[PDB]
Design a protein around this ligand. Structure first.
Ligand SMILES: Nc1ncnc2c1ncn2[C@@H]1O[C@H](COP(=O)(O)OP(=O)(O)OP(=O)(O)O)[C@@H](O)[C@H]1O
Ligand SMILES: [Mg+2]
Lengths: 416, 235, 49, 130, 55, 235, 55, 104
């Protein structure tokens, strides 16, 4: 454990598999250890900016929060995890990716994606592939979280700054549970429900309760867990999904119905929860995304009327159109995270009556263009939004007037 | 808690998740090699629940009231863990996410919350008339809500518009700020007694609140806070 | 017990039926209101005639 | 001081007090004043003028009826279009709005209701056992 | 017509001013970004050669 | 195949069935007295599948590229046999019996047939655009065919006639006569390069095929074959 | 009188539009200079940090 | 009433036309296609009655072909009889005789 594991792909035993020389280190951390405990922790306050508007606005993830990503087949769970990892380029957070039971080709593609975006400057990639023995897959997430706890307790020098915040992604805890079930059944341990051993809730819990947010007495560092669970035909009530759902603080449900309907992040806002909530958000996002949450809930209440909106009254059609524009806004391309200032500006433009003129199929394009505008014509607006994002009354007249002027200038000079 | 029960005190034990107690028992039984029962559960589920929730009784010396929180797997109330929990329950308080989305912190569904003690001869004769009529009015509102949302309140006749108004008033009136927890919408402490609840809901049920708009009843007190705020705002 | 999968598919189908019928009821109420407005607009001409 | 109730079979056109009106009657144009005797009138396709306080508004009618009472005048006309408007004859905006009124809206209604029925039937017979 | 033309011309002049402002700000941003990229590339190459020299 | 991979040659591997491999593993584990897993399957299902699949990779020396047939009983993709292989796939071709019974013998469903390599950065921008637009028009036709089931196509259509015609033409144009299908049909086989098929679908997508009826797209190669058939008929 | 006032208002509005355009362009030039200076300073600081970390 | 109780939609013969005489192959392709079309658009056959001319014709042809497949027990048909009947059905020679007489 330490600084030497940064940009290295390693075995669960710590041996490198990237072929870039031996791992340089001076300290070894044990695989299994007790969680920090009762008085060690602190309330989650610092946000983890995943870059996805829907996640960062509706399902906040904070430093020290265990947020499960639960989906089915190909819904973008690894895409969401990689987008979250890529968004920590200058956020002072060290990412860890475990990849239990995956392909060697899939892990190679993930590592290539990380290193083509510069993310390997702060990322550790543990790897226990499918061909490797079930023992390595069983000990992989614990090796990853041991490295994460080294980052949390001591910290590493990242970009010349001491970093004590770690974000760990267990990219398949369903595969980890499958590997441990194979281990237990080959040891002739008595099976339980779905042939999983009795200590399979214990299994993951030791792994996940180690992700903490320590107080200033114990260093102030944090370890953020992003477990990934693959369901079968959206069977949320299966054994391992219920175990991880009960353990984790919040859930991010990805639906194949939304994925095949064009929703690029296939996020189900209705059932997905983050019980940390507004404490894991910036004050700007807290002030802006409340109306987004309310309008999206209203649209989900009226989703059956979407194709019939031309035959309804004025207020219901207005609610349906607003919900459709907001849902089109949440669609994001892969490997394109957005900073918190860009998300706040876009959601302020959408929350106020500014996207009503632009039609629904262009909303996404509008967003992109607006960001380019804010990236070229008005960097001062982005800096102003980022500067007072922690203000309790975030829409101060200065930043409010600057953002309104930027939105009006963009809308007047563009046609859709 | 049984120590303080032995001193004659009235302890109120809280249990964070009795279903996780059930799951711990099931995992322990699986680890001991015992044969599984029902939905993969432990064979000793009934006895394990009995050895815990039969110590929660009203002894002649002292008493232990308890409040569990139950996780219902797959929303299946016939699942063996909720089935065995329900055998020992004396009251249920159902929280709904729909009520929570309407910014109602005590998101208690009065049409889904039951209690065995809700009897005329135990909690009071007026208790099992006020509670019964409040539940009837709320059930009428639940029946008429789809019609109101589809058509509107103009189609509703008399004795139904008034019923819907009173139902909305009580539904918004069930909310409390929980000013003891943090200070969200803080106000002077009330701790509304049972008799005060009965009197306030009998007052509103017998009219006396129709002039109040359906926005004052929010984090209010004992329907005297409601009229006090009504007089303060505009009267 | 046919199957968990088959009953789940039936549940999804009947839920889709419920959503479709709810949308039909809403648009039928809207069309009824519009038709009533048309009837009331036509009524003065018929009364004068 | 007579309120002109120009009403069509689909909608009421005008219900305001008018001090002077003409009428393209089948036996000669008749100008009705607020004191005119009771009268019944058949209107061929012509051009009625509303001259309330010197208004002089042309108003094209394509036939109908007129009942003149000593204190009110009602026109039961078949189809009417305003002669002057802004554009020549019928305004372009009127045709643009009516183009989406019974053509686009009706087509969207038919398509939406049909597709809802078809989805209901398709997911209906797949349920098999209730 | 004069009132309409005055309002339209004022709005068009403001829009053209903001377009020129956006153009010059974007040009300066591009120049600063390419200068920063040149500086960073030079620093990286010099760091590599200094690493070799100390190696 | 690994010998030909180690010689630098790009070798092709066809596993004619995967669920039979899973069944053989389950039978072997049951016969050996191993503890059953999941629904009576082998505990080493994931490990056995990984041991098989991880040897099929693209290396610096050579590359084993594989196609593996999987039979899903009914429509159950959650069975252990297709579920354990989903993690090892780069592309899935979903064959449907409904398309097969419509005489489209290469019964590939264009919808629900995904690929990781279908990216503009890999197969080119034109390939990605053509494939995405073909999937879009087929998705629109999936609802428009239901719509025209009761309301005839001539009754009302706002560009729906054109997109329905194009979608029928392209879903017939997906059908291709096979070299090994001469026994079933007698039609000689056709081979289309990857460039020619995307060029043909681009040509057919925007005009140039609206005059040729939906009978000359049935069993053809590229769009030039469809044309040659059309002007052979019109002689 | 309306025509005279309309012409006067047109001239006043176009003069004010020219003045506001000049002010907007000047503010844009100032912002562009400040942003370029801050980007160059950030690049220099990053280069110095790279020097120190390379040593 | 489907006495042989053949579920043609899910029943499969992997040998296919190779296990048929050439007469049966000639007279069975259209039968299989029409039955597939009927199975597809048989959802709009219980209560949806308007449809259009094409959908009603396809439904009714499928009904005639399904009624043609009903057989009594212990009464096998020779291959010549089967191909003659299928040629009669597939060449629109049964389009006038109503459905509840087809077997007869
Ligand atoms: N936001 C997105 N927009 C567009 N395409 C996306 C997006 N997210 C994912 N995809 C596409 O969907 C594919 C599947 O996503 P991904 O591999 O992340 O899913 P998964 O749940 O991890 O699946 P697996 O079970 O294969 O590991 C990606 O390879 C990518 O091509
Ligand atoms: Mg994945």
């Amino acid at each position: 454990v330490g600084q030497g594991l940064l940009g290295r792909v390693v075995n669960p035993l710590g041996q490198p598999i990237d072929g870039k020389g031996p791992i340089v280190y001076e300290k070894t951390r044990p695989i299994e250890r007790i969680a920090p405990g009762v008085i060690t922790r602190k309330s989650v306050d610092t946000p983890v900016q995943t870059g996805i508007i829907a996640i960062d606005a509706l399902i906040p993830i904070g430093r020290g929060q265990r947020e499960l990503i639960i989906g089915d087949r190909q819904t973008g769970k690894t895409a969401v995890a990689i987008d979250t990892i890529l968004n920590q380029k200058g956020q002072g957070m060290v990412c860890i990716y475990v990849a239990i039971g995956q392909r060697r080709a899939q892990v190679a593609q993930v590592v290539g994606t990380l290193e083509r975006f510069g993310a390997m400057e702060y990322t550790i990639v543990v790897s226990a592939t499918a061909s490797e023995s079930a023992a390595l897959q069983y000990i992989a997430p614990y090796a990853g979280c041991a490295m994460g706890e080294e980052i949390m307790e001591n910290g590493v020098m990242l970009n010349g700054q001491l970093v004590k915040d770690a974000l760990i992604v267990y990219d398949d805890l369903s595969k980890h549970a499958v590997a441990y079930r194979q281990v237990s059944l080959l040891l002739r341990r008595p099976p339980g429900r779905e042939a999983y051993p009795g200590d399979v809730f214990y299994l993951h819990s030791r792994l996940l309760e180690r992700a903490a947010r320590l107080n200033e007495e114990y260093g102030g560092g944090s370890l953020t867990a992003l477990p990934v669970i693959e369901t079968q035909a959206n069977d949320v009530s299966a054994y391992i999904p219920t175990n991880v759902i009960s353990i984790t603080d919040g859930q991010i449900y990805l639906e194949s119905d939304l994925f095949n309907a064009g929703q690029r992040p296939a996020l189900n806002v209705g059932i997905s929860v983050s019980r940390v909530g507004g404490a894991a958000q910036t004050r700007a996002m807290r002030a802006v995304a409340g109306k987004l949450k309310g309008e999206l809930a209203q649209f989900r209440d009226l989703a059956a009327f979407a194709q019939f909106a031309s035959d309804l009254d004025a207020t219901t059609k207005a609610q349906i159109e607003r919900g459709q524009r907001l849902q089109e806004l949440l669609k994001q391309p892969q490997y394109q995270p957005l900073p918190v200032e860009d998300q706040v500006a876009v959601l302020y433009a959408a929350t106020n009556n500014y996207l009503d003129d632009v039609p629904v199929p262009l909303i996404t394009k509008w967003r992109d263009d607006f960001l380019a505008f804010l990236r070229t014509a008005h960097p001062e607006v982005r800096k102003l939004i980022y500067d007072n994002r922690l203000d309790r009354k975030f829409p101060t007249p200065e930043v409010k007037e600057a953002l309104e002027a930027a939105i009006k200038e963009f809308k007047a000079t563009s046609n859709y | 808690a049984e120590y303080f029960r032995d001193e004659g005190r009235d302890i109120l034990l809280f249990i964070d998740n009795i279903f996780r107690f059930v799951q711990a028992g099931s995992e322990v039984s699986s680890l001991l090699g015992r044969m599984p029962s029902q939905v993969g559960y432990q064979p000793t589920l009934g006895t394990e629940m009995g050895e815990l929730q039969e110590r929660i009784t009203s002894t002649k010396r002292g008493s232990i009231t308890s409040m569990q929180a139950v996780y219902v797997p797959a929303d299946d109330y016939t699942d063996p863990a909720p089935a065995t929990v329900f055998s020992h329950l004396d009251a249920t308080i159902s929280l709904e996410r729909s009520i929570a989305e309407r910014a109602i912190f005590p998101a208690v569904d009065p049409l889904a919350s039951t209690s065995r003690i809700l009897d005329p001869n135990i909690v009071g004769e007026e208790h099992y008339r006020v509670a019964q009529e409040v539940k009837r009015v709320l059930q009428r509102y639940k029946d008429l809500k789809d019609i109101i949302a589809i058509l509107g309140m103009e189609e509703l006749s008399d004795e139904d518009k008034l019923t819907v108004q009173r139902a909305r008033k009580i539904e918004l009136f069930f909310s409390q700020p929980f000013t003891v927890a943090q200070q969200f919408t803080g106000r002077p402490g009330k701790y509304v007694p049972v008799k005060k609840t009965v009197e306030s809901f009998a007052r509103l049920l017998n009219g006396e609140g129709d002039h109040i708009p359906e926005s004052f009843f929010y984090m209010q007190g004992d329907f005297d806070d409601v009229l006090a705020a009504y007089e303060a705002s505009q009267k | 017990m046919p199957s968990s999968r088959e009953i789940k598919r039936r549940i999804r189908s009947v839920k889709n039926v419920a959503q479709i019928t709810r949308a039909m009821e809403m648009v039928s109420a809207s069309k009824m209101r519009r038709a009533q407005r048309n009837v009331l607009a036509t009524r003065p001409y018929a009364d004068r005639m | 001081p007579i309120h002109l109730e120009i009403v069509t079979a689909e909608r009421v056109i005008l219900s305001d007090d008018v001090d002077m009106i003409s009428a393209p009657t089948k036996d000669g144009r008749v100008g009705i004043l607020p004191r005119h005797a009771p009268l019944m009138t058949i209107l061929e396709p012509g051009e009625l003028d509303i001259i309330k306080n010197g208004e002089r508004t042309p108003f094209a009618v394509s036939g109908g009826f007129m009942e003149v009472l000593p204190h009110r005048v009602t026109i039961l006309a078949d189809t009417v279009e305003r002669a002057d408007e802004i554009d020549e004859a019928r305004a372009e905006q009127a045709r643009a709005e009516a183009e989406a009124r019974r053509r686009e809206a009706q087509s969207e209604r038919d398509m939406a209701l049909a597709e809802a029925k078809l989805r209901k039937e398709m997911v209906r017979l797949r349920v098999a056992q209730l | 017509e004069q009132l309409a033309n005055a309002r339209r011309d004022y709005e068009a002049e403001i829009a053209r001013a903001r377009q020129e402002a956006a153009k010059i700000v974007a040009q300066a941003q591009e120049r600063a970004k390419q200068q920063e990229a040149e500086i960073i590339a030079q620093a990286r190459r010099e760091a590599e050669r200094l690493k070799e020299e100390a190696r």
